[PDB]
Design a protein around this ligand. Structure first.
Ligand SMILES: Nc1ncnc2c1ncn2[C@@H]1O[C@H](COP(=O)(O)OP(=O)(O)O)[C@@H](O)[C@H]1O
Ligand SMILES: *[C@H](C[C@H](O)Nc1ccc(N2C(=O)C[C@@H](*)C2=O)cc1)C(=O)O
Ligand SMILES: [Ca+2]
Ligand SMILES: [Mg+2]
Ligand SMILES: [Mg+2]
Lengths: 777, 142, 153
């Protein structure tokens, strides 16, 4: 490699990289750095004593919790699949090493890890792009880019669909490298008011992001919704078009913020006063902290300029094809919500001074509205009364619904501006969606996000069991005692098939009782006790109340059915709807035109998504968050390890393996008659009376099936300790034999000295002797 | 035993008061009744029945010899002890032999154990078998 | 099954351990096993107690006729072979060169399996004359040969 700006961007090894013995070098656990490099000093069984290389200190550590260190031969590697040791300790290393040096990418084997910078990096430039263009994953250093190429490459020549699902925690890098993958794939395959299809595709983020993203402690720009953009290519491998598909907007945020969070960015920028010539178009007063719906949490995200992100937003509309009409409408309806929020009011209307702004914006009447919001209608057709709450939360629902109905318009609208009918042949659809989140308290909100992931966790697993079969044959074994996967469909069925809680909360919303036991029971009586996953709540940290409990891939999660019916349908004053439905605003009217619960709508949104992905040859990018504080170049010891345990570190009920070598150097003591690497092990089992199905003897390693290994470990430990006893009885029996002649002679000794004395007495007791002595002069 | 005989004879005479060249029933009940507590009658009678014919000197050393016929020497003895002196200290800390003798070999019975230590030579816990042997069998006094 | 004389070697021996607690025609159960080692065996403690062993001297007394069977018992039991021992000790030799530190050896013998009083260890280490080097390690191979070698080579 020669080098323009591959520098603090890609590998960088001639200006940095310039004593090791894998017998004393190893990693021990460290409460501070996760693990720590140290040297082994002494042994005493399960008490391997060592000196901490670093601070040169001393401590004891179980021979087990110690982990092998990789020779310096693999420092800052680029395919941790190559390292000698791909274990839990060494992986944390090779990544932190790279991370501190600003390489922010790594291919641990068939993956593409990506520790978040939290700093702007110079590695996405056109120069760098082209230096990555067309190149094989190996002739070029790790980098998101080539992750996308190999897709296009394969798409073109392998003629199929490609998918790059980027998944990480929150604030990791997902909704970031997702953009780079579109922006790249578009720098390379270009085709040629309204801007360029290229420009549009790209520009269509500040909008979607403007309405669907907000501040979360974890992340200033958290993506409150899922996204799945496809990118089709023409019969000449050119961008023929793209189509978006957002999943599960967080309706609830529109009116509430946990402290330390903000509402969807826009709202805040709308009061930014970026385009003053609009304050009066929306009736807004450039002040965020003045509208109850957006000022509940923090009002500003450090390093996120609203005024600008506003101007940039607007611009974006221009380029998507939006008009001055459509555009401004968007804003208006958005602006309105702020006010829908201010309508003050047991008590009924307290002033109407603002409720009017809402009246004007949505292009309908102050009277009709302000009226229906208190005295609405409905087989019988009546009029009802609503109180202090039967109205406030009635407004809450108004806004949310609007913002929601709106968002969908925004996507749908955007999918129109890039619907060009150029001929389509294969697509490269990136997918940026959140992940299995399990809060202290979990509801319908969470069951969704998660259920969604459940199906995704089966896609990955389906695809991993595939390469499995590809390791099963190279080192040539067919080993099909496949029997598996059921446990993942288990939770999957219980969540989407007909009789699952997911059609119940859907038909139990048709049934006109709609009360929370009418459902918080329907399930029970249908799945309570009748499942392995579904179970009554458990019993721990600071968790809230939870009704049924799911056995998700990531684990068991408690769920609260309180108010799901409502959360599932859309409880707006059907009264106001039609009031809106018939309006003088092209949007509002459209927004409320002439099934669809939040979930039979997801049922498909998702059934659809999968059917796409399963038509692709996937590519995974695992984003990892380095630390809470968010400063670039830092590593939260644990935090990382944690993540590294939930993706691909290498599993779920598959047969384990061992290079034939190491099987000898570990389990030979088990079948002791041997003295060739692979034949040594090749024997042991046979003699160990091993049932032949429990294993297969491929050429590089041995594949075992369950705890067959664990059964060995267990056997080993039982044996190792018997020998030890045996060697001890040998020491024991040796002594008893050393001290055996002294044992025999003494018996002669204690016979001379009893008999004699036992005579010498008789004699002192002999009448004659007595006499004799009396006479002894 | 050559010159032990020099004594037997000595004893015989100082014993044979009437010096009836023979040790008589009245010959004992005399010399005894002369020094210490003399024996009874059957006591005496059993002393004579212990000798085939009249008590001439011969018949005298004869009854004695049998009574010393199966004793091991002062070596086969003094060394039979030392086998337990590991240290070559000329002593068996008391309790050791006390237990050796009683709860091992052919277990020494109570009174059998009592008379053997009645006068045995004991010091600072130790036990001088060296002396105790030179007493049990033989040397040092008369 | 045993040969007459084998039974004679038991006959001879037994009549010594009987002697030591008292010639009474019986042997303390505690010593029952300790008696089998005098016949070139090395039945682990779990074995001896398995046939009639005892942990405290003075709980049960055993006559010959009874003894013998208990012996045939402690025979069919597994004895260690050089390899085993080696393949066991080897599981403590990291360097691989084959040296097992001093303290460790003491540990193994006095911590693992059926343990040993520091004495025996300290004894068996004198008898066989095991020697640690300047660094302080002994080759287990050499030690293992001696323990199996017997006190009288
Ligand atoms: N590659 C990157 N370069 C610079 N900053 C990044 C990068 N990846 C992530 N970040 C930082 O982390 C924040 C969170 O990233 P984001 O992609 O939005 O996370 P996610 O979608 O995974 O929830 C970003 O706002 C940004 O500050
Ligand atoms: C990370 C959770 C974590 O790291 N632990 C586990 C995740 C996943 C699994 N699975 C599967 O997903 C399939 C089989 C299996 O056991 C186990 C543990 C998270 O928070 O996302
Ligand atoms: Ca006895
Ligand atoms: Mg995001
Ligand atoms: Mg006379």
């Amino acid at each position: 490699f020669s080098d323009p700006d591959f520098q603090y961007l890609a590998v960088d090894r001639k200006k940095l990289m310039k004593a090791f013995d894998g017998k004393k070098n190893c990693w021990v656990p460290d409460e501070k750095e996760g693990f720590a490099s140290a040297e082994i000093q002494s042994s005493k069984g399960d008490e391997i004593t060592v000196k901490i290389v670093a601070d040169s200190s001393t401590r004891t550590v179980k021979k087990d919790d110690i982990q092998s260190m990789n020779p310096p031969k693999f420092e800052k590697l680029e395919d941790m699949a190559n390292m000698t040791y791909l274990n839990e300790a060494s992986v944390l290393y090779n990544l932190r090493s790279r991370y501190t040096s600003g390489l922010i990418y790594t291919y641990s084997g068939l993956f593409c890890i990506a520790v978040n910078p939290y700093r702007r990096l110079p590695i996405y430039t056109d120069s760098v792009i082209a230096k990555y263009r067309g190149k094989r994953k190996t002739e070029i250093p790790p980098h998101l880019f080539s992750v996308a190429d190999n897709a296009y490459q394969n798409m073109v020549t392998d003629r199929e669909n490609q998918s790059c699902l980027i998944t990480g925690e929150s604030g990791a890098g997902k909704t970031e490298n997702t953009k780079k993958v579109i922006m790249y794939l578009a720098k390379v395959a270009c085709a040629v008011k309204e801007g360029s299809l290229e420009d549009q595709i790209i520009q269509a983020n500040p909008v979607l992001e403007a309405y669907g993203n907000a501040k979360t402690t974890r992340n200033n720009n958290s993506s409150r919704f899922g996204k799945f953009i496809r990118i089709h290519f023409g019969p000449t491998g050119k961008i023929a078009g793209a189509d978006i598909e957002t999943y599960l907007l967080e309706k609830s945020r529109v009116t509430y913020q946990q402290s330390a969070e903000r509402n969807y960015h826009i709202f805040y920028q709308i009061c930014s006063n970026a385009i003053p010539e609009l304050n009066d178009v929306m009736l807004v007063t450039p002040d965020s902290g003045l509208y109850s719906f957006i000022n509940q949490g923090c009002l500003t995200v450090d390093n996120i300029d609203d005024v600008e992100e506003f101007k940039l937003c607007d611009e974006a509309f221009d380029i998507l094809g939006f008009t001055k009409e459509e555009k401004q409408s968007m804003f208006k309806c958005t602006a309105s919500i702020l006010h829908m929020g201010e309508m003050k009011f047991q008590a009924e209307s307290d002033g109407t001074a603002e409720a009017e702004k809402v009246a004007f914006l949505c292009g309908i009447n102050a009277g009709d509205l302000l009226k229906a919001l208190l005295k609405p209608k409905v087989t019988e057709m009546v009029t009802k009364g609503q109180n202090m709450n039967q109205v406030v939360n009635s407004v809450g629902a108004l806004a949310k619904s609007l913002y929601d109905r709106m968002f969908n318009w925004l996507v749908r609208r955007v999918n129109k501006t890039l619907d060009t009918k150029a001929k389509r042949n294969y697509y490269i659809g990136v997918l940026d969606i959140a992940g299995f989140e399990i809060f202290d308290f979990n509801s319908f909100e969470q069951l969704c996000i998660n259920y969604t992931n459940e199906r995704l966790q089966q896609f990955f697993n389906h695809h991993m069991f595939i390469l499995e079969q590809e390791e099963y044959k190279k080192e040539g074994i067919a080993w099909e005692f496949i029997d598996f996967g059921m446990d993942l469909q288990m939770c999957i069925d219980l969540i989407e098939k007909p009789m699952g809680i997911l059609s119940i909360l859907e038909e139990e919303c048709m049934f006109p009782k709609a009360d929370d036991k009418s459902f918080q029971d329907k399930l029970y009586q249908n799945h309570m006790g009748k499942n392995r996953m579904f179970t009554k709540p458990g019993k721990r940290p600071n968790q809230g109340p939870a009704h049924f409990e799911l056995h998700h891939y990531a684990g068991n999660v408690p769920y609260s059915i309180t108010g799901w019916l409502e959360k599932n349908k859309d409880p707006i004053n059907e009264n106001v709807v039609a009031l809106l439905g018939a309006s003088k605003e092209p949007l509002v009217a459209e927004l409320f035109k002439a099934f669809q619960t939040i979930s039979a709508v997801h049922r498909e949104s998702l059934n659809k998504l999968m059917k796409n992905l399963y038509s692709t040859h996937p590519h995974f990018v695992r984003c990892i968050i380095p630390n809470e504080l968010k400063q670039p170049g830092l590593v939260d010891a644990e935090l990382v390890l944690h993540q590294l345990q939930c993706n691909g570190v290498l599993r779920k009920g598959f047969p384990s393996r061992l290079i034939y070598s190491e099987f000898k150097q570990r389990y030979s003591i088990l079948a002791p008659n041997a003295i060739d690497g692979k034949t040594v092990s090749e024997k042991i089992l046979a003699g160990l009376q091993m049932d032949p199905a429990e294993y297969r003897l491929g050429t590089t390693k041995v594949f075992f099936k369950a705890g067959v290994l664990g059964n060995l470990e267990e056997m080993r430990d039982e044996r190792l300790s018997k020998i030890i006893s045996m060697f001890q009885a040998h020491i024991r029996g040796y002594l008893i034999r050393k001290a055996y002649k002294k044992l025999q002679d003494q018996r002669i000794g204690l016979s001379v000295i009893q008999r004699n004395i036992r005579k010498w007495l008789v004699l002192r007791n002999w009448q004659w002797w007595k006499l004799y002595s009396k006479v002894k002069p | 035993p050559q010159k032990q005989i020099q004594e037997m004879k000595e004893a015989f005479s100082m014993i044979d008061v009437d010096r009836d060249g023979f040790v008589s029933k009245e010959d004992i009940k005399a010399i005894s009744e002369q020094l210490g507590r003399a024996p009874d009658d059957k006591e005496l009678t059993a002393m004579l029945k212990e000798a085939p014919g009249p008590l001439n000197f011969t018949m005298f050393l004869s009854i004695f010899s049998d009574k010393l016929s199966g004793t091991d020497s002062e070596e086969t003895i003094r060394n039979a002890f030392a086998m337990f002196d590991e240290q070559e200290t000329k002593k068996l800390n008391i309790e050791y032999i006390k237990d050796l003798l009683e709860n091992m070999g052919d277990n020494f019975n109570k009174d059998e154990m009592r008379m053997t230590f009645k006068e045995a030579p004991v010091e600072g816990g130790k036990f001088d078998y060296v002396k105790f042997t030179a007493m049990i069998k033989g040397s040092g006094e008369e | 099954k045993l040969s007459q004389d084998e039974i004679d070697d038991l006959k001879d021996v037994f009549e010594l351990f009987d002697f030591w607690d008292g010639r009474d025609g019986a042997v303390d159960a505690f010593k029952l096993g300790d008696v089998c080692r005098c016949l070139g065996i090395n039945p682990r403690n779990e074995d001896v107690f398995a046939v009639g062993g005892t942990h405290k001297m003075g709980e049960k007394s055993l006559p010959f006729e009874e003894f013998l069977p208990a012996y045939e018992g402690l025979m069919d039991c597994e004895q260690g072979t050089f390899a085993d021992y080696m393949e066991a000790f080897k599981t403590f030799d990291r360097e691989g060169q084959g040296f097992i530190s001093g303290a460790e050896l003491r540990h193994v013998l006095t911590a693992l399996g059926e343990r040993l009083s520091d004495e025996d260890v300290d004894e068996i280490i004198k008898l066989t004359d095991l020697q640690e080097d300047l660094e302080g390690n002994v080759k287990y191979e050499d030690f293992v040969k001696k323990v199996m070698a017997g006190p009288y080579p």
